[PDB]
User: Fold this.
Amino acid sequence: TTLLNPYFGEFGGMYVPQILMPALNQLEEAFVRAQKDPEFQAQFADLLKNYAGRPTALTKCQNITAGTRTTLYLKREDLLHGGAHKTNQVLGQALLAKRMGKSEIIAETGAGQHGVASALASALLGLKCRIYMGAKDVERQSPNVFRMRLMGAEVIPVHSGSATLKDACNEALRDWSGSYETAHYMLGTAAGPHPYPTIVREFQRMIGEETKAQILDKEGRLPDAVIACVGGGSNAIGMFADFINDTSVGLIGVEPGGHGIETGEHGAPLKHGRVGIYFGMKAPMMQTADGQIEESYSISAGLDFPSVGPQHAYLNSIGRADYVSITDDEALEAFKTLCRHEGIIPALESSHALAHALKMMREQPEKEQLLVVNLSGRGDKDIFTVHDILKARG
Amino acid sequence: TTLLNPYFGEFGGMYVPQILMPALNQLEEAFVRAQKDPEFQAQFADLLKNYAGRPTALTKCQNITAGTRTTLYLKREDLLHGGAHKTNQVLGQALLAKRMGKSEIIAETGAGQHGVASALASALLGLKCRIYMGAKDVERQSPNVFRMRLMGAEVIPVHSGSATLKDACNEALRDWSGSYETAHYMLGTAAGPHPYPTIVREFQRMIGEETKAQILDKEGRLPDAVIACVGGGSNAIGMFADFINDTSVGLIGVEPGGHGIETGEHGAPLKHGRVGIYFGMKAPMMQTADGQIEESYSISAGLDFPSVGPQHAYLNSIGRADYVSITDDEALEAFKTLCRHEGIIPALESSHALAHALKMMREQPEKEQLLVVNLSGRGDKDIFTVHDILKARG
Amino acid sequence: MERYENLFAQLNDRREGAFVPFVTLGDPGIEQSLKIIDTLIDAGADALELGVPFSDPLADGPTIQNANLRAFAAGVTPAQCFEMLALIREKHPTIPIGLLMYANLVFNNGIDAFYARCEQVGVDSVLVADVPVEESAPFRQAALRHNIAPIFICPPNADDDLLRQVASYGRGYTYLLSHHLIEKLKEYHAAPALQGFGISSPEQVSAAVRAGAAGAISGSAIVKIIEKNLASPKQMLAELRSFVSAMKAASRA
Amino acid sequence: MERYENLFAQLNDRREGAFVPFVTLGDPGIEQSLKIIDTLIDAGADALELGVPFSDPLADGPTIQNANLRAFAAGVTPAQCFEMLALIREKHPTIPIGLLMYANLVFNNGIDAFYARCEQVGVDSVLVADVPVEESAPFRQAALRHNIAPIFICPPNADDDLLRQVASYGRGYTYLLSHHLIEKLKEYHAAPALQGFGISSPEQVSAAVRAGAAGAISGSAIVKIIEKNLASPKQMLAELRSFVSAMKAASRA
Ligand SMILES: O=C(NCCOP(=O)(O)O)c1ccc(OC(F)(F)F)cc1
Ligand SMILES: O=C(NCCOP(=O)(O)O)c1ccc(OC(F)(F)F)cc1
Ligand SMILES: O=C(NCCOP(=O)(O)O)c1ccc(OC(F)(F)F)cc1
Ligand SMILES: O=C(NCCOP(=O)(O)O)c1ccc(OC(F)(F)F)cc1
Ligand SMILES: *Cc1c(COP(=O)(O)O)cnc(C)c1O
Ligand SMILES: *Cc1c(COP(=O)(O)O)cnc(C)c1O
Ligand code: NA
Ligand code: NA
Assistant:
């Protein structure tokens, strides 16, 4: 039994080996206790404000919407310490780990961003952090690996399987099953077994809460729609959460279309995958007709999660949220457009969300609409990727 | 004649060719007018808040001071849009340019940070930006050059002279002398001819103003000392300004010591240079016994200005502010220490300020002192530099 | 299910424990795997636990991880695994055959359809590694509907509620991960317990039986013999036969 | 100072303008520079404007920028420049010699000491490029104390206040950057005006004199001849002689 519902409709659950259930149950109870503890909330708020830099700005982009009836605001998570929204929830999970009396952190990472976030939170809060990363990703993300080590984290390369994220995830769990008494597994997105989808959403919901307060202050009304990219689903659910009961506000999640849905080389399991059971949850995923898990492709490494958070699959099923996809080229165009017109370099992940907002504006330029795009992170890290591509095309 | 005093004691002035005086006089008048214009102040405040992300946090660093009686706070300019304090003043200067009816911006840059800042401000405010950069720096700062171009700025390599910063400065001025009617020269530090030292200080003083309000709120008293690195002098004077009349607050500026003052390979003209006239001002500078201008060396490219702002030279002369130096190795140690103990990667420039605070703490661990270090920028940009050095030493 | 009941009844009459080896189907190839399995049986295996290659075996250590990789290098698919199972059953009518599965391979084409296929080829039990008792309802229901025993893991620290659940929901045998637990399981009338995890020597088999367990399961130790003799198929079988006969001997009275 | 007064009085009696070439001292080398200067004088130069190599000539275009670089490649220093000046004066007693300086080289070892050195070697005027009239006090005072004429630039858009200042503070000649200005300068009794910047053809020299100016200054045009004939020292002098004689001819009545 559990204190909270592990499911969002048919999606979610706790599909892990029996040996890990005590760890999940312990975590759920600690979370429930922490959420009703004023002291925990005060400490979390203090770190978010004085260390991470919250609240983040809500920037109106007047140049990019010129000539149309679209008003666009960007929620600036790119201004958060670390350069991405990931920082919010790792701070919350780090505090939960300490609440449970743990002094060690286990984390998995693909593009290396969650690894860096986990490392910085652990350094700040005095936790011993060990990070599992696929050997392939370790070689492709030399910068992030060095950042993790600079912050005192132990980085462990994973060669098993395709030597990527999913393989790093499996290795992190194996470790945790035998060390959960003293170590907490800091999952990096709103997915995986309950209670993670719920915990990550709650530790990211300040994104939407601040956005609501800021948009009401600046426009005197709610957005017609809030748009966010969806890799695993944390920044999107963080933005969506506080607006779920505001039925007039559209919730639009953007999955990576890669080279195009029809090419099969994409990362859009929610709308183009098939429900399966993996990563400890029942959710849409990239898989063969046989049931073997595949990989998600995207120009943006941060959106390469072959599945998606269960709450997103649920919100989609009941029609509360709509999900679309944006290709590598559309994301690249949005990236270049924001740089040139607003002086902000967006993460390629976030560029997918912006690209869809630009499409909403351009396709119907006379449609009056107030949109908010969650700028999940900054794109200084993507400069080389964009440069090589542009050059490769002359 | 001028509206404001061009001198700080014997330092400062307007040592430029007669042809450029009208441009300086125009700028001074526009600035004076803008400072008493509530609308200009409101627009500047709006950009700082909703675009740049002000106010920035004041972070207490408890881990790093453990075992001592030092309490250390870091003013988080690293959280400012762009990753450095430079953003504050480029936004102000961009608004001044528009106030004067100009649609073009001319900027000089060495490490490329000011170039990036000028480019982002110009992109946001619809200004045509052209940046002069020494060919040597262009080749060494490929990332920043690409960022500038991504934001629509025209980057012009300068081969004349030592093909570095000082040479880029000269070329920017030549252009301006014949285009000031439609173009504004966005100088990047609190130096150069009047009114720049004054304008840059005023457009950076929110650093100190916020710090004062934040420290009073958190500690109920003023700092025993505020510490900042000094390349040209903008982030330091920005922090110092609001505390100048608070005589109990020490003002400590940190110049780069490079390989060591005794080696001659450093960038500490204020305390180890000789007064001269160059860059349009009378101030301490790196020069031969003959009067030829030399270059400042530092592991941190951002602190390679061979001179220093005139107000700093003045504050030093009357004993209001004290200036010291920190070597490459001391700065590197501070960089590694902040990463590991606070989960913050500081710019190598800022690491010089932190290194001195660490020295104040370590040399007299039982001395009760409340210190604030201006964390002028983030250090993600220095990862490669630090990595290569560490590796080179095994 | 019935095959397990018959096996344990017979073993009890002989006062001996069961020795159950585990191997990945298709490792290192379909043909060699079939030979490996026949050798295990001829050497003394009382029952078999067989794994179907899965892309992400997050419940397996390095040895088994590599077994799956070798199987995949051989192009082994679940469909081919079921063909192998059908043949194994056709060759050996009474030996209990249990599968070690990962949830997605069971859920993929429908849970009911998976267990129906198991019944069709002659499988006796299925242990789904990543399905805790808390999520087992649809799996154990489909298993029972097709006369397949749903196997559950009993952790060494399992509380009383879990012991009662495992005792009530499981059939065939209770998978006990490596005295009190064994006695409690018998008190709640749980399926006979087989100790698994880290069993690699004869003394461990005798110890398990002495502790009250009905037998022991050994996998990594078996698979290690396979991977260390990849270049020598004949020597591989010879060493497998020697290891299994030694392990089975340790279970006899 | 006095040399300029004598020159202009003599030129006025002959109803002609002055042609004043500019070159960087030591470009491309001490010896060749001394020869270049003697050629300029023998060819018809009425006065000379000489630059002392500086590390950052932010008031000079590419041509002069490279002249300084060449001088530095030759190891030319301000001290060597003053030695050259002493010799030039020893060879030519009446030709006015003006220096084009950057403030730091004047301020370096003391402003007063610099002008004293100028007087000692026989220099007649000094134009400090980066010192506007607003900052000129200490410079023009030291200049006058040592009988050196302080030269000031008069921009083509200079307002009335600036014209009055330049007229009052300057001596020797007023440097007019390229009709109304010239008349205003004479009205305020300013030093005779010499037009400079972009003067590269005989017609420009005659035009300047026709506009009321006392003469014209040409630098880049002269220096260009130097850099294009670096590999041919002899041809360099020949072409310099031809250019200067043509330019000087254009100033005669
Ligand atoms: O949380 C995610 N994986 C969960 C795997 O699920 P499970 O191991 O089943 O809980 C996940 C995937 C990538 C990530 O960050 C980054 F891209 F930066 F590497 C963070 C988290
Ligand atoms: O302002 C400074 N130079 C002034 C030169 O003075 P002047 O040209 O005489 O006004 C100056 C130097 C470097 C800079 O930024 C960066 F390091 F990033 F490149 C910004 C400004
Ligand atoms: O049967 C298998 N192991 C056999 C022997 O273990 P070993 O001898 O150590 O390889 C085996 C059975 C269940 C399993 O999933 C979970 F861990 F969740 F229970 C993993 C491996
Ligand atoms: O005398 C020099 N130029 C000579 C001829 O100019 P050109 O013929 O075009 O090289 C000359 C004189 C003053 C000067 O400084 C400042 F610009 F501030 F006035 C720069 C160059
Ligand atoms: C990690 C990352 C994402 C993808 O993860 P979600 O969990 O889907 O938010 C998106 N944007 C940025 C900048 C990221 O670093
Ligand atoms: C530009 C820079 C500096 C040096 O300039 P000042 O004008 O002396 O502040 C210091 N820190 C950072 C992060 C910078 O980018
Ligand atoms: Na995904
Ligand atoms: Na300096």
User: Anything to note?
Assistant: Chains D and C do not touch (no CB pair under 8 Å).
